[PDB]
Amino acid sequence: KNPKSDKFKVKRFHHIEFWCGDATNVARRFSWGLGMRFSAKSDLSTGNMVHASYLLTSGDLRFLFTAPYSPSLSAGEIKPTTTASIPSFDHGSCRSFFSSHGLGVRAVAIEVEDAESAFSISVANGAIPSSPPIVLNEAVTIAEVKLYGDVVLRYVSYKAEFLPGFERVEDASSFPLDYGIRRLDHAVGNVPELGPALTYVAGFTGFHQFAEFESGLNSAVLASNDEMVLLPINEPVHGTKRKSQIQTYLEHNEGAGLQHLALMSEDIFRTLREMRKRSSIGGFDFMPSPPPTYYQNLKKRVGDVLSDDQIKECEELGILVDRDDQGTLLQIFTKPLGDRPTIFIEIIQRVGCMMYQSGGCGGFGKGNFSELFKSIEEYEK
């Protein structure tokens, strides 16, 4: 059931902004590790005396990495005279965020028809304002409201390349890496209590609950009208034998925040070969692989969608497979992206639900919990 109750017109995920202490090093690590090209910059070389911001792209996926310069460089400026290319940036806010959470997502940015209207309607409907609508070079409007913890939902709209004040990077310094990643599929937040977070966010967006089908979580997925913008939220399940990873997140993150980014690949086998090649030479590590009994059981579960060659190719790369009533999902998870056991990345590919492909096709892999438990028992035997 899809009531299509969006309170304003939402298009797609536009970008994800990380707040760091040094944007250069994080960005270069991510670029090599995920096969994303350097495509735009806003920094000292472009006249920005406030923050350094570097954009990585792969397909439609846009990762923005931002860090503050010394406030002394811009002590003379006022908001009307600022050289910051992202007007919502605040030195104090950024340093506070990073010292409290470490490396993490500050903004989930969705493109809308009218950022000003989206902000006004949102705030009219309970959204806590974070940064008012600002019009950039009469071309782009940006606005921000609080999402959960210190994460904001950022509205972007275009009258008619990233943002004004960003320069395209010299493609001597722009190597065309690409491991097949194409777009952001979903972005997941961890909160201490799911109910009030859902009510708040659904309240100001009109996003509806996406239909789902002893893991440590309860969760729910908010979706836009066409279900291309997907914003799941988890809370911990306490009192279990094994400690909830959601709770472990909240402890090490100092509260609520974004837990994982799921990036869609057009060829998850090529992506995972390319990423695993680089795990120990600057890239990303992956979750420990499941026991081969897991692979000795998915011919009986998806043997009509994957050949015996492809299911074995899943066993090399450590891919998990799950199935809705309408589609199939291939997925794998990185180890945490930074020092703390907080944010991580998920690579996914969806098979089915062709009309274009409809969003959420195959679900989000919650079935792999009991399947991995089951498999672990059978591998012990």
Ligand X SMILES: Cc1nn(C)c(O)c1C(=O)c1ccc2c(c1C)c(=O)n(-c1cncc(Cl)c1)c(=O)n2C
Tokens 């969006």 appear where?
6
Q: What share of the chain is helix, strand, coil (3-state, %, to 5)?
A: 30, 35, 40
Handedness of CA 89, 339, 61, 154 (dihedral sign): negative
Site string for ligand X, 305-334 (x = CB under 6 A): ----------------------------x-
| The only residue of 7, 9, 11, 28 in contact with a copy of itself, by rule CB under 8 A | 28
The phi, psi pair for 75, rounded to 5°, reads -60, -25
CA triple 285-287-290, angle to 5 deg: 140
Residue 252 among known ligand-binding residues: no
Whichever of 281 and 354 has its CB closer to a copy of itself, that residue is 281
Residue 295 touches ligand X, criterion: CB under 6 A? no
Q: Which two tokens stand for residue 25?
A: 């090093």
| The only residue of 346, 347, 350, 351 in contact with ligand X, by rule CB under 6 A | 346
Residue 364 touches ligand X, criterion: CB under 6 A? yes
Q: Which two tokens stand for residue 119?
A: 């902000």
Residue 186 touches ligand X, criterion: CB under 6 A? yes
Residue 43 touches a copy of itself, criterion: CB under 8 A? yes
Residue 260 among known ligand-binding residues: yes
Q: How far is CA 214 from the centre of its chain?
A: 25
Residue 72 touches a copy of itself, criterion: CB under 8 A? yes
**CA distances (Å), origin 208, targets 201, 246, 308, 328, 336:** 10, 23, 38, 22, 30
What is the Cα–Cα distance from 356 to 367, expressed in whole angstroms?
25
Which of positions 150-179 make contact with a copy of itself (CB under 8 A)? 172-175, 177
**CA distances (Å), origin 76, targets 48, 67, 81, 160, 322:** 13, 19, 9, 34, 56
- Going by C-alpha positions, the residue among 143, 146, 116, 151 that lies closest to residue 128 is 146
Q: Which does 366 bind (CB under 5 to 8 A by kind): Co ion, a copy of itself, ligand X, none?
A: ligand X
Stretch that binds a copy of itself, among 5-13, 203-211, 228-236, 338-346 (CB under 8 A): 338-346
Residues that bind Co ion (CB under 5 A): 262, 346, 364
Q: Which does 219 bind (CB under 5 to 8 A by kind): Co ion, a copy of itself, ligand X, none?
A: ligand X
The residue ranges that bind ligand X (CB under 6 A) are 186, 188, 219, 221, 232, 245, 260, 262, 287, 333, 346, 364-366, 368-369, 372
The residue ranges that bind a copy of itself (CB under 8 A) are 20-26, 28-29, 31-33, 38, 43-44, 52, 67-70, 72-73, 95, 98-100, 102-103, 172-175, 177, 251-254, 279-283, 285, 337-341
